[PDB]
Amino acid sequence: GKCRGLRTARKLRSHRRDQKWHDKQYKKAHLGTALKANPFGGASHAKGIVLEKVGVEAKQPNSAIRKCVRVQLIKNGKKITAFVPNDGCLNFIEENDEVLVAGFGRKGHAVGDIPGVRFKVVKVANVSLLALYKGKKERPR
């Protein structure tokens, strides 16, 4: 057992310091080892260039395959696959366009969604896709 003496504050303080460092959450937070762990490098969003549309080039009319695109992140040059929210938003997006990408799928994947894709397209030319779809804004060139 541990010491339960009246004059043992220094011994008790040393035990609690050691217990803190064994917590993996405490070490990671104080040393800053995982600040840049996420694919966005610590940011919540990222900007990318639309490479080409894998779903449309294949002729499968699944509508879950059709809304997959390939983009290249500007910050680190990685190539990822993202979802377009709806078929017909593909018409607003052209190749070599600049888009804003957010995360997707932490909660999970719905029925009819392709597993292993963890990104979605939110804006093109700094305009939200829903506003373009609803006819509230026009895409500047």
């Binding site: 999970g108 994947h109 719905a110 029925v111 969604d113 597993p115």
Partner: peptide, 29 residues
């Protein structure tokens, strides 16, 4: 008929996630 359908919809919701669907299919196998 509508009452019977609504009971199945709750079971459909009770596994509507992708990992849940693959969960039983290994278990039924």
């Amino acid at each position: 008929k509508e009452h019977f359908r609504a009971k199945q919809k709750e079971e459909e919701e009770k596994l509507k996630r992708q990992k849940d669907l693959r969960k039983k299919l290994f278990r039924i196998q």
